[PDB]
């Protein structure tokens, strides 16, 4: 289905779809392929989960439901039609879909059609309403009555299937074919009208049963056992988890990249217990104001250093021209994209990736030179008034990029040389 990497890369229409959904994706994609000419497959190669998420979001569909039961008759009536529910009616009733498609594009209008439909007795029959000759219906819609009837016959023919004997009431009533007793009660048998004909409640009940069967066979779509069926689980062994416990052997390496004696510590301990029982003065704790002054110097130096650390506690406010700010952000963004793709190629590790690595290396070099030329532009645009800040802002991505270039050169010298 539409789930492989190849399928997701193939769906150019879906790619354009979420493209048109976003705006920064036009920005990024335009710079990536329109401006830089990157292979758009490798563009989308990162965004594969996003593509699949968009596809699966677009791909779901609802389940069937009794749309005619949700239809209410609502003096006068005003049509308040919902197109999704109109198509729901179409899908649930292909007869109604057919009656739409041979009349509205031929004879009259859609709201006129639906007014005729709500007027029609075919609507009442398809809904849970007993048909009545007092009702006149709509003649145009009610011409489809026998067509819907033979649809019902064909659908019932499709719905017929053999039954399991374990639950077969037909086999149950065919237990004794020579039962000769008495005629059962009118009360518990299906009653009829005065002239022997039925009222049709059996028809409406078999119709709603047909609706149920249609729903369950819609469930039963494309998208022996009695031994298991008759198991009595209540007298069986309880399930126990096979979860594995874990122990932990403990032997850690010592931290890598004079010794005191009991006599000496005991001597000092005796002496300091003597001093402890001897004396203790709070007033002697006051310092000499000179080594204390050096303490003041050290403390104040620490305060100054950490205060300058705290002095640099939406992005930050900047005094850049807004266009050059956007341009440099754009260049940073596409350089980051190039760098990520180059790392994807490099950490892949194949000889098939070699020309890709070389070409992305060329693109990184081009981005470097374009960064330098941008630096020349902000040079002769500022006289290095804040072109220094421009260079420093674009610095770290450039450092990482050129570090990657050095890594590529080093591995080239490692393998080839």
């Amino acid at each position: 289905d539409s789930l492989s990497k190849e399928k997701l890369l193939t769906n150019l229409k879906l790619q354009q779809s979420l493209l048109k959904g976003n705006k920064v994706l036009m920005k990024v994609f335009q710079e990536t392929v329109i401006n830089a000419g990157l292979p758009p497959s490798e563009f989308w190669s990162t965004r594969i989960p996003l593509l699949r998420a968009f596809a699966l979001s677009t791909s779901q569909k609802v389940g069937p439901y009794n749309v005619l039961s949700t239809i209410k008759p609502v003096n006068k009536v005003n049509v308040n039609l919902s197109r999704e529910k109109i198509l729901n009616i179409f899908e649930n009733y292909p007869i109604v879909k057919k009656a739409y498609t041979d009349n509205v594009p031929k004879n009259f209008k859609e709201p006129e059609f639906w007014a005729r439909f709500f007027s029609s007795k075919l609507f009442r029959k398809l809904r849970g309403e007993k048909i009545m000759q007092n009702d006149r219906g709509d003649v145009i819609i009610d011409r489809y009555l026998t067509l819907d009837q033979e649809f019902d016959r064909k659908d019932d023919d499709m719905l017929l299937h053999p039954v399991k004997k374990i639950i077969d009431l037909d086999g149950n009533i065919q237990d004794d074919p020579v039962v000769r007793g008495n005629r059962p009660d009118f009360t518990m048998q299906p009653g009829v009208d005065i002239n022997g004909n039925s009222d049709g409640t059996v028809d409406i009940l078999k119709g709603m049963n047909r609706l149920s069967e249609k729903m369950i066979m819609a469930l039963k779509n494309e998208y022996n056992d009695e031994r298991n069926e008759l198991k009595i689980d209540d007298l069986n062994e309880s399930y126990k988890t096979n979860y594995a416990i874990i122990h932990l052997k403990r032997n850690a390496h010592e931290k890598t990249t004079l010794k005191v004696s009991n006599q000496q510590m005991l001597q000092q301990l005796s002496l300091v217990m003597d001093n402890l029982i001897n004396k203790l003065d709070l007033n002697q704790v006051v310092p000499n104001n000179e080594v204390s002054n050096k303490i003041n110097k050290r403390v104040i130096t620490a305060i100054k250093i950490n205060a300058k650390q705290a002095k640099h506690n939406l992005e930050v406010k900047s005094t850049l021209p807004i266009d050059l700010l956007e341009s440099c952000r754009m260049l940073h963004t596409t350089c980051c994209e190039f760098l990520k793709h180059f790392y994807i190629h490099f950490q892949s590790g194949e000889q098939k990736q070699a020309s890709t690595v070389k070409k992305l290396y060329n693109h990184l070099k081009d981005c470097i030179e374009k960064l330098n030329e941008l630096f020349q532009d902000v040079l002769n645009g500022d006289g290095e008034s804040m072109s220094n800040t421009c260079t420093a802002y674009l610095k770290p991505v450039l450092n990482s990029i050129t570090l990657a270039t050095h890594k590529y050169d080093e591995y080239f010298n490692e393998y080839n040389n």
Partner: peptide, 21 residues
């Protein structure tokens, strides 16, 4: 190949079309 080129050129038109919009 050649048949992939018109597809990208179709994407080229769509990218230009979304630009003015």
């Amino acid at each position: 190949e050649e048949r992939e080129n018109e597809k990208t050129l179709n994407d080229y038109y769509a990218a230009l079309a979304k630009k003015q919009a």
